[PDB]
């Protein structure tokens, strides 16, 4: 007794990732309909991704060389953090797993005896590749790792509208019914379950399962079903953004430049730059934020229209209620400091397939699904609070307040453990939330606000293997700088 029809409401990145993934997972064995407005646009942002996104394209059977040119896409090997510790300081948060020497990470050996003033230069390859604007692939397509299960779980930058167009064509070609219309009413039955959605001129769209991809407005879950929403704003005050699209070497990383009341993203696409100021409206006005952003970008922004966005920061109490699942901004959101919006969508849809119901609608599937999503969002929220707490700067009220806001449960205890020994698998938020322990280590070392200590055991061990590893990183960096093409060179002859 299996379900027969899914209705997806919304045609942004969330809706078309949902629809395309459903056809990849279930084929023609279930019907999928997507309805989307002709007049309400998508949010217009969401252009950097997280490590897991490679597996989304793999699941659909899409190779980089076919979708990347069609989506204005580049590689994201890291995030470059600027001015978080102090003025003029920068460091990389790379998609690069730790090197472990005799049971201890190289970063631990570094902390014992720093080889330079840059932990990321000494311990990692990827930051240097970003500085040299390198492609992660040689001109013959082979990944650089093969010349040294991957140590480099990288991601992408792309135009979210082009990706959504690409997945729409992917999904419609595989039988997804596409309705271009407004949902004007969500009809509930006597159980409070969704019976159908009423469209302006396409009749009623009926189905067994309804996916709310309507964005922040959450027309099905938050509005029609009145599901409570849990704000994160007390712990993360950034509630606003102003975004620009700007004409444009391609640095394979996102840049996050701390500002007086937030931070500015720089996302390099193949032929343009996406940039925006994420800020706290209680500290600066939208006018000041736009002024700051335009001055930061410089003359290239003098003719670009600013896109002002109010963010709904938090998560729904439940994400799957009755026969309705929220995917995308309707489900939850944190500021894009670590590029988690599309990660949340992929997690939501992957776990919806894994917990997909039959006609018995086992409530335990909902309970498990909701716990998984809540744990992912709570964990990312904790990770982001650490960004502001561990940022060394306390130069104004905003950056002082970043250390006195209420911490999520358990973070105070974890902060104390991290100042005893660097974070590892057993000293971070103990549920899946995307980020691995190496991300915590890098952020703490770069942000520089905590009192970090190396493990005393290192003093009783042979330092030779660690010294060899540091030397090896330098040799491999030198070889990669000589051989890898620049990212522009790579895409220039790939766009042939
Ligand atoms: C400033 C900012 C920066 C971000 N940066 C990143 C980033 O770097 N990386 C990342 O991964 N994510 C990022 N995100 C998150 C990202 O934008 C979302 O995860 C993603 O775009 C999915 O959005 P959505 O589809 O849920 O909502 P939307 O894009 O708002 O889509 C809503 C859809 O519902 C439709 N709709 C609405 N009402 C109706 C109706 N009545 N009837 C029919 N259809 C309707 C609309 O037409 C639209 O198609 C960012 C978000 C913001 C605000
Ligand atoms: Cl995000």
Author numbering: 0 to 147, 161 to 260, 266 to 513
Q: Which sentences did the original study use to describe this structure?
A:
Our results show that flavin cosubstrate/coproduct (FADH2/FAD) and substrate (Trp) cannot bind simultaneously to either AbeH or BorH.
Orthorhombic AbeH crystals grew only in the presence of FAD and crystallized in space group P212121 with two AbeH/FAD complexes in the asymmetric unit (ASU). Density for FAD could be clearly seen and modeled in both chains. A Cl– ion was modeled in each chain in a strong spherical density peak 3.2 Å away from the re-face of the isoalloxazine ring of FAD (green sphere in Figure 2A,C,D); if this peak were modeled as water instead of Cl–, difference maps showed residual positive density. Lys75 and Glu352 superimpose with the catalytic Lys and Glu residues identified in other FDHs structures.
